[PDB]
Design a protein around this ligand. Structure first.
Ligand SMILES: *[C@@H]1O[C@H](CO)[C@@H](O[C@@H]2O[C@H](CO)[C@@H](O)[C@H](O)[C@H]2NC(C)=O)[C@H](O)[C@H]1NC(C)=O
Ligand SMILES: *[C@@H]1O[C@H](CO)[C@@H](O[C@@H]2O[C@H](CO)[C@@H](O)[C@H](O)[C@H]2NC(C)=O)[C@H](O)[C@H]1NC(C)=O
Ligand SMILES: *[C@@H]1O[C@H](CO)[C@@H](O[C@@H]2O[C@H](CO)[C@@H](O)[C@H](O)[C@H]2NC(C)=O)[C@H](O)[C@H]1NC(C)=O
Ligand SMILES: *[C@@H]1O[C@H](CO)[C@@H](O[C@@H]2O[C@H](CO)[C@@H](O)[C@H](O)[C@H]2NC(C)=O)[C@H](O)[C@H]1NC(C)=O
Ligand SMILES: *[C@@H]1O[C@H](CO)[C@@H](O[C@@H]2O[C@H](CO)[C@@H](O)[C@H](O)[C@H]2NC(C)=O)[C@H](O)[C@H]1NC(C)=O
Ligand SMILES: *[C@@H]1O[C@H](CO)[C@@H](O[C@@H]2O[C@H](CO)[C@@H](O)[C@H](O)[C@H]2NC(C)=O)[C@H](O)[C@H]1NC(C)=O
Ligand SMILES: *[C@@H]1O[C@H](CO)[C@@H](O)[C@H](O)[C@H]1NC(C)=O
Ligand SMILES: *[C@@H]1O[C@H](CO)[C@@H](O)[C@H](O)[C@H]1NC(C)=O
Ligand SMILES: *[C@@H]1O[C@H](CO)[C@@H](O)[C@H](O)[C@H]1NC(C)=O
Ligand SMILES: *[C@@H]1O[C@H](CO)[C@@H](O)[C@H](O)[C@H]1NC(C)=O
Ligand SMILES: *[C@@H]1O[C@H](CO)[C@@H](O)[C@H](O)[C@H]1NC(C)=O
Ligand SMILES: *[C@@H]1O[C@H](CO)[C@@H](O)[C@H](O)[C@H]1NC(C)=O
Ligand SMILES: *[C@@H]1O[C@H](CO)[C@@H](O)[C@H](O)[C@H]1NC(C)=O
Ligand SMILES: *[C@@H]1O[C@H](CO)[C@@H](O)[C@H](O)[C@H]1NC(C)=O
Ligand SMILES: *[C@@H]1O[C@H](CO)[C@@H](O)[C@H](O)[C@H]1NC(C)=O
Ligand SMILES: *[C@@H]1O[C@H](CO)[C@@H](O)[C@H](O)[C@H]1NC(C)=O
Ligand SMILES: *[C@@H]1O[C@H](CO)[C@@H](O)[C@H](O)[C@H]1NC(C)=O
Ligand SMILES: *[C@@H]1O[C@H](CO)[C@@H](O)[C@H](O)[C@H]1NC(C)=O
Ligand SMILES: *[C@@H]1O[C@H](CO)[C@@H](O)[C@H](O)[C@H]1NC(C)=O
Ligand SMILES: *[C@@H]1O[C@H](CO)[C@@H](O)[C@H](O)[C@H]1NC(C)=O
Ligand SMILES: *[C@@H]1O[C@H](CO)[C@@H](O)[C@H](O)[C@H]1NC(C)=O
Ligand SMILES: *[C@@H]1O[C@H](CO)[C@@H](O)[C@H](O)[C@H]1NC(C)=O
Ligand SMILES: *[C@@H]1O[C@H](CO)[C@@H](O)[C@H](O)[C@H]1NC(C)=O
Ligand SMILES: *[C@@H]1O[C@H](CO)[C@@H](O)[C@H](O)[C@H]1NC(C)=O
Ligand SMILES: *[C@@H]1O[C@H](CO)[C@@H](O)[C@H](O)[C@H]1NC(C)=O
Ligand SMILES: *[C@@H]1O[C@H](CO)[C@@H](O)[C@H](O)[C@H]1NC(C)=O
Ligand SMILES: *[C@@H]1O[C@H](CO)[C@@H](O)[C@H](O)[C@H]1NC(C)=O
Ligand SMILES: *[C@@H]1O[C@H](CO)[C@@H](O)[C@H](O)[C@H]1NC(C)=O
Ligand SMILES: *[C@@H]1O[C@H](CO)[C@@H](O)[C@H](O)[C@H]1NC(C)=O
Ligand SMILES: *[C@@H]1O[C@H](CO)[C@@H](O)[C@H](O)[C@H]1NC(C)=O
Ligand SMILES: *[C@@H]1O[C@H](CO)[C@@H](O)[C@H](O)[C@H]1NC(C)=O
Ligand SMILES: *[C@@H]1O[C@H](CO)[C@@H](O)[C@H](O)[C@H]1NC(C)=O
Ligand SMILES: *[C@@H]1O[C@H](CO)[C@@H](O)[C@H](O)[C@H]1NC(C)=O
Ligand SMILES: *[C@@H]1O[C@H](CO)[C@@H](O)[C@H](O)[C@H]1NC(C)=O
Ligand SMILES: *[C@@H]1O[C@H](CO)[C@@H](O)[C@H](O)[C@H]1NC(C)=O
Ligand SMILES: *[C@@H]1O[C@H](CO)[C@@H](O)[C@H](O)[C@H]1NC(C)=O
Ligand SMILES: *[C@@H]1O[C@H](CO)[C@@H](O)[C@H](O)[C@H]1NC(C)=O
Ligand SMILES: *[C@@H]1O[C@H](CO)[C@@H](O)[C@H](O)[C@H]1NC(C)=O
Ligand SMILES: *[C@@H]1O[C@H](CO)[C@@H](O)[C@H](O)[C@H]1NC(C)=O
Lengths: 121, 432, 121, 121, 432
């Protein structure tokens, strides 16, 4: 159907079915250096996102359901507005200021989970 | 029982490539990473780490990096091949003090013009140290003509020793020893991890170390082997000694076109009278400082030993004198007035100036330093010494130098590079 | 609390709570080449460790409990000394000579596990 | 026993016990550039395969049992011929033309599985 | 049913960039990876692989790599532009044997001195092949003056063909064919995987292949198309033929300064008498060897065919003679004494020597080979031939060459580069 970013204007729940479409598009000596820098950067950016998913316990997934509650102060909206009316670009603007808080919480709940699972073994 | 852990705080000694960072330069210009305005430092509690400043490869990297930057900065500048001609020289005799008698030569020559069909008769002033008498008693050549090509530094690139920060690549870390009274080797407590080194100014000098860092509490003596007379002793002061240098001659500059788009910067007539370049060191300060140095040398040589200071041994000008670049000109000052004592206003050190410079210890790549107009005045801090021991009841110390690695070793002595090794295993009591 | 390597002088069980702190810090043409080599190497080293965890069955984890027994000959100490007195730097020296043996055993038990799990499906 | 590619002439079921052997072997300015390009490429190729395993739900595995049926039209052979007579080089030629079909099916079944698992939580 | 496997031993033909490894060189110096002292080789049981030496891109890479290294090694050396002047030449007539009569020229000229105001009258000896008579019957110019700039090789960089190992990057592998009696194309059993190639010496030559590897059992004839007379035939011997070459003239060298830091290395007077350079090939050995070559040619041309050997056809010196570099000097030897027979002590091959060399088949980049002092003696192995078939009951073979790729193709014929493709799928009987 749609190709890369074709779902950008779609709602969040219509999109998020195309996650593999975007994931797969992330992959004279002076010209050689400029291109190696571009390629090295693409790899480094990719790996930082993968490392981050790993420490949150979401390695290998495109959709990862976590064990952190949603604070209503981050966005006081119902699922109907978020998944049926909004697009991902709009959502990203709405909660930009809470991104680092959420990320810190995700890392911490994984550290606790990982240890509890060791004690049970 | 085996449990695998990743992200374990373990490291090993390692050698890697560090990158430069910084807040018209010869050295760090645009090929340098902007610094972090709020750099981090982390104290490591209960960590003892062995450091060895004499085997620190950060010194070798800095030496290589500054030489390569130096050369890259001269590569595009004007070649002075047309200047290696027979010169007709006389003495500059107008209002010359005795100290300058015979120091300046007034030389005329036939130089290339923009057009290949024409030559021009031009003249310029040279220092006696820049020329060689040949044959015809007035005939001279530049000193480098039988050895190497000479290029003119571009008079837009300054030699100011702007500080460079070295930073580790990911996977590596730089450990810093904060143990006061650390003598360069062995273990030390009080180790911290830093993202980058402090800024280090690539100041080039012999005998006296200028504008560096100071010891926190006491004057320190550091050496690879204190009983080996073949090794140098680095001395770090805990207080600066101020030195004031000058070239009290109002010079002018003239531009001689030597080709289609190229020019030679020549020294023109000098305004006012002619005086010798010199440096002033406060005498009382020097004596107090020397006081402290001897007190510390006695810890290794005996408190009933006679410690004598003497001037340098023979060798080339670059070795026997205190060489430095200030105001854009290269000075060679006589330090025999500083190192002339048994045990322990101002002291005036006369200086010579050169225009043709052979950097480091290389042969084959000479540069011409364009003259600076006006009068030069410099104020700097002596922060240390390079001494060599001459050697049964007495020891004599003399000024040393000429090996630039000794001037960086004195700033990088606190840093070590290690490699992070995040995997490890240990017994636990669980089973998959 | 502590930043990068701040736990280096701490005991093994006090440390190992800071694993994400260290994991996240692992990420004129001549100058360009020197820096690309440094960046390429950082990536290659990172990936070798991740590949190794993968073949041992520990992908995506910071703490991975395996199915290999501990030979008392590698280190005849009780959990109390290892986790409460020793630091990780000391431990690494103590068992340096057994690292390759342990790694070989981890790879082999995973190969057997992976096959048994195929036969059960 | 065997080193890299030593199992190349072995049958498919004799091979496939050596998967870690091959997996571990995948890891003047002009000379510097040529070598950086070779190293950057090795990393990019490695990561594309890992990304692909991830979207199929096989992250971290050397053997991954999926939920896609085998169409007899891709290769009408019994397990005895495939695993006991054929080598992997022969097999690769036999089904080369169906590789993209199979890959598309693997991606799609994972997308459906991943969503069903979200609804169950 | 679909099961995914990763790490599957599957590969495809591929072209990649190989890197050099090795255990003052022109070629591999410091821009080369140190080798593994204990390299691996893995025999692949039951693997048949198709090889084609004529389409092997490892040859193209080696050709490009050696030319680029060659040029990088001349780039920083002294330019001899000042030498392209009118020369005044006479004959060297002192104690000259007949074979050398007219071979050496004694030439004087006005050369640049370190100073731009002065010239010097100097002289040097040149070989007849290095100069062109112009106009005034004594006036000459160097041969390259109407074609190209010439540079002097730095007399510190040797031309010794130090062996280079080619190694595959990760994700790739090099397969080696160990099948004895492999003729360069088609499938072969007995394939092994290697980390790197054996060391290959970048020996440059025409007609005769020197210091290479030998066939394991029989002399082998290899060609792209044996019935196409437009293709060359490479012949690999199973035994070496020893060849001894020399320049029996005690030469001296003199250094002429031609500028500020530059010098020309000229041939000075020659000590002793003047004799012709030559190479000795054992006659019996050559005959036995040629014996074996014909026996094998008959397999393709008929055992009732008359196989004749003949000398080279016309062309330039670089084509019609056996060119090689030994002892640092470039020899052009006459091989008509080796290829003069129907079917099938020592044979002496006279040689000429040149100082001005145009490498490969390029025009525009000439080099001057500085003279070597003393007397040159070389001992080397002839390991093969390059033959061209001249073509109804007889066939004539003549020496060929001039295309350097043929000299590497003869060493790299056993290697193939493949790409590893670790993913695969297969039906299994399990379900997620
Ligand atoms: C250096 O020598 C030059 C001449 O080569 C001096 O210049 C001349 O000075 C006289 C003084 O009466 C003038 O009349 C001439 O016209 C000047 N010649 C030129 C070409 O300008 C010059 O003053 C000498 N400089 C010093 C410092 O002695
Ligand atoms: C440095 O200055 C000192 C004195 O200021 C010079 O010393 C003189 O050197 C000559 C050489 O034989 C002696 O005869 C004099 O007696 C020395 N004077 C004193 C006061 O000792 C010294 O030569 C200068 N050095 C340089 C390199 O110029
Ligand atoms: C010589 O050393 C002194 C003492 O280290 C330097 O003066 C200090 O410079 C820092 C820079 O911010 C100031 O914060 C200190 O207060 C200064 N100390 C004093 C007493 O003024 C001095 O600048 C150094 N001189 C040179 C030329 O670098
Ligand atoms: C090449 O020619 C030069 C002269 O251009 C010869 O050198 C001269 O040899 C005579 C012999 O009596 C000497 O007296 C001269 O002094 C030499 N001239 C110079 C400039 O040295 C030279 O010997 C000739 N070389 C050969 C090989 O014939
Ligand atoms: C190579 O050596 C042979 C003989 O050693 C030279 O052959 C002579 O060539 C001339 C050319 O017309 C003939 O007239 C002679 O009869 C030939 N001699 C023999 C014995 O055949 C040959 O020219 C030399 N080649 C080169 C390139 O110098
Ligand atoms: C010519 O070929 C012979 C035979 O291949 C070379 O001699 C061999 O060199 C290897 C090198 O280690 C020795 O192990 C063999 O024992 C040698 N064989 C003999 C019979 O001595 C010979 O070195 C080659 N010559 C040159 C100049 O390379
Ligand atoms: C764009 O908005 C219209 C409004 O209803 C919607 O129907 C359409 O599907 C949207 N585009 C996409 C890609 O969904
Ligand atoms: C939600 O966020 C507010 C601040 O925005 C914080 O005070 C509150 O404790 C948070 N709630 C929870 C459950 O953490
Ligand atoms: C959100 O989507 C629903 C879907 O029917 C629509 O009815 C509603 O009006 C939308 N709300 C907004 C604010 O766009
Ligand atoms: C995020 O910070 C900006 C800073 O001005 C603020 O204007 C914006 O409203 C903040 N966003 C939210 C969702 O509060
Ligand atoms: C010395 O300086 C005075 C100052 O005016 C000047 O007049 C005089 O000519 C100078 N001497 C010479 C030789 O130029
Ligand atoms: C220049 O001054 C020196 C001082 O010693 C003297 O020896 C020399 O002869 C002078 N030259 C001329 C040309 O007066
Ligand atoms: C410049 O060239 C002329 C040409 O005859 C010469 O006479 C004069 O002495 C040269 N000038 C100098 C300063 O050498
Ligand atoms: C520096 O301190 C160490 C500590 O053991 C000592 O061994 C070494 O000799 C000292 N260096 C000097 C120059 O005394
Ligand atoms: C230090 O120098 C003395 C001088 O002879 C030498 O004997 C001693 O071995 C040196 N120390 C070391 C550690 O080499
Ligand atoms: C250097 O110049 C400063 C300027 O104020 C002066 O105070 C200081 O005493 C001078 N130092 C010497 C050694 O003369
Ligand atoms: C330097 O200190 C010594 C200590 O004895 C003293 O004798 C000497 O006069 C001092 N020199 C100066 C210049 O104060
Ligand atoms: C040097 O001073 C120290 C200070 O305690 C003392 O122990 C040592 O014996 C003294 N040496 C001499 C030669 O007096
Ligand atoms: C050191 O002082 C002595 C005193 O005679 C002098 O001869 C010697 O040349 C001086 N050294 C230097 C480098 O000036
Ligand atoms: C060294 O000290 C003595 C003491 O009288 C003095 O005469 C001599 O000039 C001094 N040397 C120097 C170079 O100042
Ligand atoms: C140098 O001479 C120029 C001539 O105008 C004058 O303006 C300048 O101030 C002088 N410089 C000094 C330092 O006296
Ligand atoms: C350092 O050792 C002391 C000794 O008890 C300990 O209390 C402290 O916590 C240690 N440092 C760290 C970071 O744990
Ligand atoms: C423990 O290691 C020893 C050798 O260090 C070995 O002989 C023994 O079999 C090992 N034990 C087990 C259970 O593998
Ligand atoms: C190990 O840690 C425990 C904690 O209480 C302490 O009591 C014990 O003495 C420590 N042992 C050693 C050898 O440090
Ligand atoms: C590891 O090998 C070294 C080699 O000398 C040995 O000294 C050390 O004791 C060994 N370590 C252990 C834990 O046995
Ligand atoms: C090669 O084929 C033979 C035929 O039976 C087989 O026994 C052998 O094991 C095969 N090679 C490998 C590596 O399995
Ligand atoms: C099997 O493949 C054929 C085409 O090759 C297709 O028509 C058929 O529907 C496929 N079977 C299944 C179960 O998808
Ligand atoms: C397949 O392998 C079995 C193993 O015993 C053998 O009997 C059979 O003949 C083989 N078939 C073919 C076609 O090679
Ligand atoms: C794959 O396509 C090629 C194209 O010619 C065809 O010949 C081959 O038989 C196809 N393979 C299969 C298994 O059908
Ligand atoms: C040099 O020798 C050749 C030999 O043929 C002769 O023709 C030529 O005329 C000689 N030249 C002179 C100058 O004698
Ligand atoms: C060198 O130049 C002079 C200038 O007249 C000329 O006569 C002479 O013949 C030249 N020498 C040569 C060898 O050409
Ligand atoms: C090499 O062997 C192959 C095997 O089929 C053959 O076809 C080819 O013609 C042979 N090459 C020559 C030159 O005969
Ligand atoms: C080999 O050369 C003959 C010469 O005519 C030609 O006809 C034949 O087609 C060539 N073989 C191939 C495979 O092209
Ligand atoms: C080459 O020199 C060696 C040195 O011993 C000698 O034995 C050999 O026979 C020579 N070869 C020829 C062809 O003369
Ligand atoms: C070379 O071999 C042939 C074979 O017939 C023989 O006739 C001829 O005389 C041999 N030549 C030499 C030099 O032995
Ligand atoms: C060449 O020798 C082979 C060896 O068997 C033979 O079969 C063939 O017929 C021979 N050809 C001629 C022309 O005799
Ligand atoms: C080959 O030999 C013939 C014999 O007449 C000769 O004419 C021809 O020039 C020779 N070829 C070469 C390159 O010398
Ligand atoms: C070729 O062989 C004939 C046979 O007599 C001989 O006369 C002739 O000189 C030989 N040619 C060469 C170049 O040796
Ligand atoms: C070359 O001549 C020099 C002159 O001394 C002599 O020493 C040397 O041995 C000679 N070389 C040969 C190979 O005869």
């Amino acid at each position: 159907f749609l190709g890369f970013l074709g779902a950008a204007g779609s709602t969040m729940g219509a999109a998020s079915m195309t996650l593999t479409v975007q994931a797969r598009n992330l992959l004279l000596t002076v010209w050689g250096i400029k291109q190696l820098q571009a390629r090295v950067l693409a790899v480094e950016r990719y790996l930082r996102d993968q490392q981050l998913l790993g420490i949150w316990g979401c390695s290998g997934k495109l959709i990862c359901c976590t064990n952190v509650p949603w604070n209503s102060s981050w966005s006081n909206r119902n699922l109907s507005e978020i998944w049926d009316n909004m697009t991902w670009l709009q959502w990203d603007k709405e909660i930009s200021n809470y991104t680092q808080i959420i990320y810190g919480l995700l890392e911490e709940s994984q550290n606790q989970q990982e240890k509890n699972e060791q004690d049970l073994l | 029982w085996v449990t695998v852990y990743y992200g374990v705080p373990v490291w090993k000694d390692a050698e890697t490539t560090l990158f430069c960072a910084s807040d018209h330069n010869v050295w760090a210009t645009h090929a340098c990473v902007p610094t972090d305005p709020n750099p981090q430092e982390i104290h490591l509690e209960n960590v003892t780490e062995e450091f060895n400043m004499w085997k620190n490869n950060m010194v070798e990297q800095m030496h290589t990096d500054i030489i390569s930057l130096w050369d890259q900065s001269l590569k595009p500048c004007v070649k002075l091949t047309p200047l290696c001609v027979t010169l007709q020289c006389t003495n500059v005799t107008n209002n010359i003090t005795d100290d300058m008698r015979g120091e300046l030569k007034n030389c005329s020559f036939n130089m290339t013009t923009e057009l290949r069909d024409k030559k021009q008769k031009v003249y310029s002033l040279f220092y006696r140290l820049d020329v060689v008498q040949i044959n015809s008693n007035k005939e001279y050549r530049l000193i480098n003509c039988n050895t190497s090509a000479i290029t003119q530094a571009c008079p837009k690139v300054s030699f100011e020793p702007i500080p460079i920060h070295y930073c580790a690549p990911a996977g590596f870390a730089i450990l810093k020893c904060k143990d006061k009274k650390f003598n360069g080797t062995g273990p030390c407590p009080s180790v911290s991890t830093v993202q980058c080194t402090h800024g280090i100014k690539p100041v080039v000098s012999t005998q006296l170390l200028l504008n560096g860092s100071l010891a926190e509490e006491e004057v320190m003596i550091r050496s690879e082997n204190i009983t080996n007379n073949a090794k140098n002793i680095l001395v770090q002061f805990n207080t600066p000694v101020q030195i004031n240098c000058t070239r009290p001659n109002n010079n002018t500059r003239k531009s001689i076109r030597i080709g289609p788009g190229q020019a030679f910067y020549a020294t023109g007539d000098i305004i006012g009278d002619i005086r010798q370049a010199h440096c002033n060191v406060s005498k009382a300060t020097w004596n107090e400082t020397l006081g402290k140095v001897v007190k510390q040398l006695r810890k290794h040589f005996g408190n009933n030993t006679i410690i004598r200071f003497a001037n340098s041994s023979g060798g080339d000008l670059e070795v026997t004198t205190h060489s430095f670049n200030c105001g854009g000109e290269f000075f060679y000052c006589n330090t025999s007035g500083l190192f002339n004592s048994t045990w322990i206003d101002s002291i005036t050190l006369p200086c010579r100036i050169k225009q043709i410079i052979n950097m480091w210890q290389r042969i084959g790549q000479a540069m011409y330093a364009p003259p600076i107009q006006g009068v030069i005045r410099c104020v700097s801090n002596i922060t240390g010494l390079i001494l060599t021991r001459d050697g049964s009841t007495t020891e004599t110390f003399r000024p040393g130098g000429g090996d630039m690695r000794d001037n960086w070793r004195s700033e990088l002595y606190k840093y070590k590079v290690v490699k992070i090794e995040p995997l490890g295993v240990a017994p636990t009591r669980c089973k998959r």
